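Slack export, channel: ligand-projects

TW: morning all. Re-posting the request from yesterday since it got buried. We need the structure predicted with the small molecule present, not the apo form. The ligand is manganese (II) ion; the SMILES is in the block with the sequence. No rush, but it would help planning for next week.
GE: picking it up
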Amino acid sequence: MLTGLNHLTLAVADLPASIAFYRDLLGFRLEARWDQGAYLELGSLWLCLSREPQYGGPAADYTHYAFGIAAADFARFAAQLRAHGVREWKQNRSEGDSFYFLDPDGHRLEAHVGDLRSRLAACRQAPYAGMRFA
Amino acid sequence: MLTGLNHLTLAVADLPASIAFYRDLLGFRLEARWDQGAYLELGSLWLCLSREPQYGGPAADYTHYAFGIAAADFARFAAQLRAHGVREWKQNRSEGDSFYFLDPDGHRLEAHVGDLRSRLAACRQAPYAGMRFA
Ligand SMILES: [K+]
Ligand SMILES: [K+]
Ligand SMILES: [Mn+2]
Ligand SMILES: [Mn+2]
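GE: finished. pasting the full token output, ligand included:
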């Protein structure tokens, strides 16, 4: 019986750059750092960074990691990261505000307003092709 | 400004096989499906599967997704997935029981007993190399 998400671990080529990005830019709290990785926390989320020499990042697909944000903070978050030169990988077209940006290795991140139920509710009114609810 | 994890999205080449894996072996509830993906939930975790028929899975690195499990359920889960034929990608060496297994595309998964606090406590008593706390 699984209970939910316990932790997310990301391979990173430049552990100092990745710590700076998650901690200083995104507001994760650094809880431990060692020569081959780091542990950080954001709300309930346990993030691990694993130092991976020569890691070139993932290839191009839709695998991605979305973090929550309050509606009132969305615009200012997106503006902040834009002003800091973060690269975007997707322009939003689905329910709920979303800002889609890359981390230093090219992991695909998202800041999103809404949840599974808000998505399901909007999809019932405006469904994707072949969509079925259960 | 970010609040935690909002959802995880995984690229999948074979959407029926991945739905069956997440739903039936890992106990996710299927909430919606459409011709190019699915939404599932496990506890508070929102999982999306994004259909990408030419996806070949990730390359070998330590990026991975750990789900929680209670101590009393661990052995049964590991035994169940081994009996099904699931492939493992790591043998546990760190604090807390962990079972490390691959999904149908080769995404790296883990079922883990413990949390960040238990990990930090064990690390305070026995640090990893160069380890510093924050
Ligand atoms: K969206
Ligand atoms: K472990
Ligand atoms: Mn998303
Ligand atoms: Mn892990």
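GE: first-pass observations. Residues A 64, 66, 110; B 7, 9 surround manganese (II) ion (ligand 3) (CB under 6 Å). Chain B is about 25% helix and 40% strand.
TW: perfect, thank you
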